[PDB]
Design an enzyme around this catalytic site. Structure first.
Site, PDB file in Angstrom:
ATOM      1  N   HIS A 194      -2.558   3.861  -4.557  1.00 24.99           N
ATOM      2  CA  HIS A 194      -1.113   4.048  -4.324  1.00 24.99           C
ATOM      3  C   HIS A 194      -0.293   3.510  -5.506  1.00 24.99           C
ATOM      4  O   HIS A 194       0.791   3.994  -5.742  1.00 24.99           O
ATOM      5  CB  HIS A 194      -0.622   3.520  -2.952  1.00 24.99           C
ATOM      6  CG  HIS A 194      -0.976   2.117  -2.552  1.00 24.99           C
ATOM      7  ND1 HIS A 194      -2.130   1.796  -1.864  1.00 24.99           N
ATOM      8  CD2 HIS A 194      -0.298   0.954  -2.696  1.00 24.99           C
ATOM      9  CE1 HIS A 194      -2.149   0.496  -1.627  1.00 24.99           C
ATOM     10  NE2 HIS A 194      -1.029  -0.044  -2.122  1.00 24.99           N
TER      11      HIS A 194
ATOM     12  N   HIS B 229       3.062  -5.036  -8.837  1.00 18.86           N
ATOM     13  CA  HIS B 229       2.742  -3.635  -8.983  1.00 18.86           C
ATOM     14  C   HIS B 229       4.034  -2.881  -9.278  1.00 18.86           C
ATOM     15  O   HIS B 229       5.110  -3.471  -9.268  1.00 18.86           O
ATOM     16  CB  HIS B 229       2.101  -3.095  -7.697  1.00 18.86           C
ATOM     17  CG  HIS B 229       3.014  -3.205  -6.523  1.00 18.86           C
ATOM     18  ND1 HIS B 229       3.117  -4.342  -5.757  1.00 18.86           N
ATOM     19  CD2 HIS B 229       3.944  -2.355  -6.059  1.00 18.86           C
ATOM     20  CE1 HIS B 229       4.068  -4.166  -4.849  1.00 18.86           C
ATOM     21  NE2 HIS B 229       4.621  -2.958  -5.025  1.00 18.86           N
TER      22      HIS B 229
ATOM     23  N   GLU C 164      12.511   2.599  -6.014  1.00 15.50           N
ATOM     24  CA  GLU C 164      12.614   2.583  -4.561  1.00 15.50           C
ATOM     25  C   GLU C 164      14.033   2.224  -4.154  1.00 15.50           C
ATOM     26  O   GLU C 164      14.698   3.006  -3.505  1.00 15.50           O
ATOM     27  CB  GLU C 164      11.559   1.628  -4.015  1.00 15.50           C
ATOM     28  CG  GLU C 164      10.149   2.088  -4.385  1.00 15.50           C
ATOM     29  CD  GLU C 164       9.111   1.684  -3.369  1.00 15.50           C
ATOM     30  OE1 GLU C 164       8.995   0.471  -3.120  1.00 15.50           O
ATOM     31  OE2 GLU C 164       8.449   2.594  -2.802  1.00 15.50           O
TER      32      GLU C 164
ATOM     33  N   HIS D 209       7.635  -4.766  -8.581  1.00 12.23           N
ATOM     34  CA  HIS D 209       7.654  -5.658  -7.431  1.00 12.23           C
ATOM     35  C   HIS D 209       6.702  -6.826  -7.675  1.00 12.23           C
ATOM     36  O   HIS D 209       5.491  -6.622  -7.811  1.00 12.23           O
ATOM     37  CB  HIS D 209       7.242  -4.913  -6.163  1.00 12.23           C
ATOM     38  CG  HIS D 209       8.247  -3.914  -5.746  1.00 12.23           C
ATOM     39  ND1 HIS D 209       7.969  -2.865  -4.875  1.00 12.23           N
ATOM     40  CD2 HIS D 209       9.558  -3.843  -6.050  1.00 12.23           C
ATOM     41  CE1 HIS D 209       9.096  -2.193  -4.718  1.00 12.23           C
ATOM     42  NE2 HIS D 209      10.070  -2.767  -5.392  1.00 12.23           N
TER      43      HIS D 209
ATOM     44  N   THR E 135       7.442  -1.677   1.541  1.00  9.99           N
ATOM     45  CA  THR E 135       7.805  -0.291   1.317  1.00  9.99           C
ATOM     46  C   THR E 135       6.593   0.637   1.413  1.00  9.99           C
ATOM     47  O   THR E 135       6.769   1.838   1.219  1.00  9.99           O
ATOM     48  CB  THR E 135       8.528  -0.073  -0.009  1.00  9.99           C
ATOM     49  OG1 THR E 135       7.562  -0.273  -1.033  1.00  9.99           O
ATOM     50  CG2 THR E 135       9.749  -0.959  -0.143  1.00  9.99           C
ATOM     51  N   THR E 136       5.412   0.092   1.724  1.00 13.61           N
ATOM     52  CA  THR E 136       4.208   0.891   1.991  1.00 13.61           C
ATOM     53  C   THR E 136       3.661   0.438   3.334  1.00 13.61           C
ATOM     54  O   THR E 136       3.917  -0.696   3.759  1.00 13.61           O
ATOM     55  CB  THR E 136       3.150   0.744   0.900  1.00 13.61           C
ATOM     56  OG1 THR E 136       2.832  -0.631   0.650  1.00 13.61           O
ATOM     57  CG2 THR E 136       3.572   1.393  -0.388  1.00 13.61           C
TER      58      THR E 136
HETATM   59 ZN   LIG Z   1       6.225  -2.172  -4.101  1.00 18.20          ZN
END
Ligand SMILES: [Zn+2]
EC number: 4.2.1.1
Length: 257
Positions: A61, A91, A103, A116, A195-196
């Site tokens: 991801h 990441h 994001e 992040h 956010t995932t």
């Molecule tokens: Zn993130």
């Protein structure tokens, strides 16, 4: 099975993770005119001098750089936070082209990418326990725009060819995350989520106002990564961002006037 494609992307996540439609989801649009300056907010304390990076990993991801979080070596404190938060990993999220990838957005503006830096609250002892708490994590978000190169990012860029596909990792010791920060620590803050998946509502978001600049060659290297594993059809790891979610009953606070 979740991802960022037509058939498994953000619009599908709620089926396996119903908190996707919750009351404190991330990311959000930061409306700069509506965010309230809060003079009670403290300066952020970023203490990364003793950071110990371990590995860099393509997790299908994003790619992540992992740190030793078994002691207080690289910690985030102050700002809106109570107590001490240990750096676990950083990441990025990025786009297929420079006009998307972040994001968070700022007055609906999308940046080319978003970094992040993920930290967890030491009072919960480990990150698995922290993600079950409303004040478990603090994520420091930094926007990337394309222009001049970021010298402190280059060590990352140069090892990405070795982790092209999902599941690949490499040694990534002696990386200094201070090299990824902008000059100013002025920030916005609000209560939100991962956010995932699992989209847990455990994050105090701290989003810096000042973007870093990276070069087109640096971001191009991000875009050569693959979502797929080796042997599977090649699908470029691009547009690995969740769009802005409803703000609902939340206030975004600014550390600056
Ligand atoms: Zn993130």
């Amino acid at each position: 099975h979740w991802g960022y494609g037509k058939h498994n992307g953000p619009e599908h996540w709620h089926k396996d993770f119903p908190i996707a439609k919750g009351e404190r989801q991330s990311p959000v649009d930061i409306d700069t005119h509506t965010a309230k300056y809060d003079p009670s907010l403290k300066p952020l304390s970023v203490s990364y001098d003793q950071a110990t990076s371990l590995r860099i990993l393509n997790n299908g991801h994003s790619f992540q750089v992992t740190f030793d979080d078994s002691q207080d070596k690289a910690v985030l404190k102050g700002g809106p936070l109570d107590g001490t938060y240990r750096l676990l990993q950083f990441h990025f999220h990025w786009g297929s082209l420079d006009g998307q990838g972040s994001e968070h957005t700022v007055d609906k503006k999308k940046y080319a990418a978003e970094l992040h830096l993920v930290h967890w609250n030491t009072k919960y002892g480990d990150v698995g326990k922290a993600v079950q708490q409303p004040d478990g994590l603090a994520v420091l978000g930094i926007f990337l725009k394309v222009g001049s190169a970021k010298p402190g990012l280059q060590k990352v860029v140069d090892v990405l060819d070795s982790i092209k596909t999902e599941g690949k990792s490499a040694d990534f010791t002696n990386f200094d995350p201070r090299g990824l920060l902008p000059e100013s620590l002025d920030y916005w803050t609000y209560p939100g989520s991962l956010t995932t998946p699992p989209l847990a509502e455990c994050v105090t978001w701290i989003v810096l106002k000042e973007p870093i600049s990276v070069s087109s060659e640096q971001v191009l290297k991000f875009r050569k990564l693959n979502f797929n594993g080796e042997g599977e059809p090649e699908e470029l790891m691009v547009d690995n961002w969740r769009p802005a979610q409803p703000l609902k009953n939340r206030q975004i606070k600014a550390s600056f006037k």
